[PDB]
């Protein structure tokens, strides 16, 4: 909280949008995805190896150029408008993002780099990086994580090369948008782009997991693609989403200067994939420096199948914290940052279990249940009490809540 933020050597003026915390600052520049022998680095390398070999083996295949060191500070234009995300879209809320100010932010997804890289005239590339979101707290959510983006453009003659009379076929037309295609795409083009997209991803998952994995495609919606899909993997009895993808919105591609191309794009969550691939039970593990964890990933070669031996699970301490929200001033994600900041990685989860309005006061009451559990050891009742009482006091000062208990 101030009037000027300093980040990665650059300075940004503060405004009504600014909400970066010091704690997030301690993580910007860490780049686990570039840290040799880190699990996220390992996935990245294996994905790179797949695309390299594909390029070397098949004539048809593009060279995917890799960008894994792009600054995470981007403009709201890069993060949102270049991707056709409407001005009133929920993903833009202050409570969901880390804004430096109205115009600059920590990127919420690697898709923030699609337009610029297209605009540079690239036909095929990967973007790998840390991304940032303000979200709830549990074993599957962290304010920082890592995505890998892929983008692949086709020209008409390239897409239809393997068809006999292929030069009478076209990429574009002027029809209507349906659940199956955009208004300026032909169904001929879309069918082939979709097939290529899904075949590519299916081969990549095979490369990563072997042929035993059960996967399914789910139809979905993104502003920057259409048609759009999520890929789910069945894991521990449950269908889990691992990536989004689809056919790039032609307006996005045209505006970047590739008016003669149709393309696909996908974004994959590295932590998710890594937790499934190595059976890592808690996302906080990526951030610990415990060798019992890290030593396991020091492989001779990136293809050496690592057999992650899960650490013991330590007991938790559970504490409730109740208070009265301020008179017309409060976001649930605000309290969660205060938790991240005081409780750090001692906190496994926070659940809002009760809320109600007191008639006389008119004030709203929140009750949160906080699960304290250390990834590396047993927490004492003593140390938790102190962490807990510190968060209690803080919430009073900084969030203008009323100690209810």
Swiss-Prot record:
Reactions listed under catalytic activity: tRNA(Phe) + L-phenylalanine + ATP = L-phenylalanyl-tRNA(Phe) + AMP + diphosphate + H(+)
UniProtKB keywords: Acetylation, Aminoacyl-tRNA synthetase, ATP-binding, Disease variant, Hereditary spastic paraplegia, Ligase, Mitochondrion, Neurodegeneration, Nucleotide-binding, Primary mitochondrial disease, Protein biosynthesis, Transit peptide
UniProt enzyme class: ligase
Gene3D superfamilies hit by this protein: Bira Bifunctional Protein, Domain 2, Ferrodoxin-fold anticodon-binding domain
Family in the record: Belongs to the class-II aminoacyl-tRNA synthetase family.
Cross-referenced PANTHER family: PHENYLALANINE--TRNA LIGASE, MITOCHONDRIAL, PHENYLALANYL-TRNA SYNTHETASE
Record's disease association: Combined oxidative phosphorylation deficiency 14: A severe multisystemic autosomal recessive disorder characterized by neonatal onset of global developmental delay, refractory seizures, and lactic acidosis. Biochemical studies show deficiencies of multiple mitochondrial respiratory enzymes. Spastic paraplegia 77, autosomal recessive: A form of spastic paraplegia, a neurodegenerative disorder characterized by a slow, gradual, progressive weakness and spasticity of the lower limbs. Rate of progression and the severity of symptoms are quite variable. Initial symptoms may include difficulty with balance, weakness and stiffness in the legs, muscle spasms, and dragging the toes when walking. In some forms of the disorder, bladder symptoms (such as incontinence) may appear, or the weakness and stiffness may spread to other parts of the body.
Summary of the function given for this chain in its UniProt record: Is responsible for the charging of tRNA(Phe) with phenylalanine in mitochondrial translation. To a lesser extent, also catalyzes direct attachment of m-Tyr (an oxidized version of Phe) to tRNA(Phe), thereby opening the way for delivery of the misacylated tRNA to the ribosome and incorporation of ROS-damaged amino acid into proteins.
Name of this chain's protein: Phenylalanine--tRNA ligase, mitochondrial
């Amino acid at each position: 909280p101030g009037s000027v933020v300093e980040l990665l050597g650059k300075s940004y003026p503060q405004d009504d949008h600014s909400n970066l915390t010091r704690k997030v600052l301690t993580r910007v520049g860490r780049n686990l995805h570039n840290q040799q022998h880190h699990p996220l680095w390992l996935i990245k390398e294996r994905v790179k190896e797949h695309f390299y070999k594909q390029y070397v083996g098949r004539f048809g295949t593009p060279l995917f150029s890799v960008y894994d060191n792009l600054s995470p500070v981007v403009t709201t234009w890069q993060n949102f408008d270049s991707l056709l995300i409407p001005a009133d879209h929920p993903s833009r809320k202050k409570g969901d993002n880390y804004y430096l100010n109205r115009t600059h932010m920590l990127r919420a997804h690697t898709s923030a780099h699609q337009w610029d890289l297209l605009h540079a005239g690239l036909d095929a590339f990967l973007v790998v990086g840390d991304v940032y979101r303000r979200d709830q707290i549990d074993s599957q959510h962290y304010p920082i994580f890592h995505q890998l983006e892929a983008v692949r453009l086709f020209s008409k003659h390239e897409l239809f090369a393997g068809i006999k009379d292929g030069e009478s076929l076209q990429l574009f037309e002027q029809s209507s948008r349906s659940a199956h295609k955009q208004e300026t795409h032909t169904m001929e083009a879309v069918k082939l782009v979709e097939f290529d997209l899904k075949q590519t991803l299916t081969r990549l998952m095979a490369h990563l997991f072997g042929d035993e994995l059960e996967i399914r495609w789910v139809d979905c919606y993104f502003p920057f693609t259409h048609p759009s899909f999520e890929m789910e993997i069945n894991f521990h009895g449950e269908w889990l989403e691992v990536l989004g993808c689809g056919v790039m919105e032609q307006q996005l591609v045209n505006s970047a200067g590739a008016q003669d191309r149709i393309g696909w794009a996908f974004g994959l969550g590295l932590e998710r994939l890594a937790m499934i691939l190595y059976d890592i039970p808690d996302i906080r593990l990526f951030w610990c420096e415990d060798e019992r964890f890290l030593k396991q990933f020091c492989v001779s070669n990136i293809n050496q199948k690592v057999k992650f031996q899960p650490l013991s699970k330590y007991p938790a301490v559970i504490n409730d914290i109740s208070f009265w929200l301020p008179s017309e001033n409060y976001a649930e994600n605000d309290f969660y940052d205060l938790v991240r900041t005081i409780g750090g990685d001692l906190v496994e989860k926070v659940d809002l279990i009760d809320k109600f309005v007191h008639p006389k006061t008119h004030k709203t009451s929140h009750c949160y249940r906080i699960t304290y559990r250390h990834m590396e050891r047993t927490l004492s009742q003593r140390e938790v009490r102190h962490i807990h009482q510190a968060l209690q006091e803080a919430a009073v000062q900084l969030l203008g809540v009323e100690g209810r208990f």
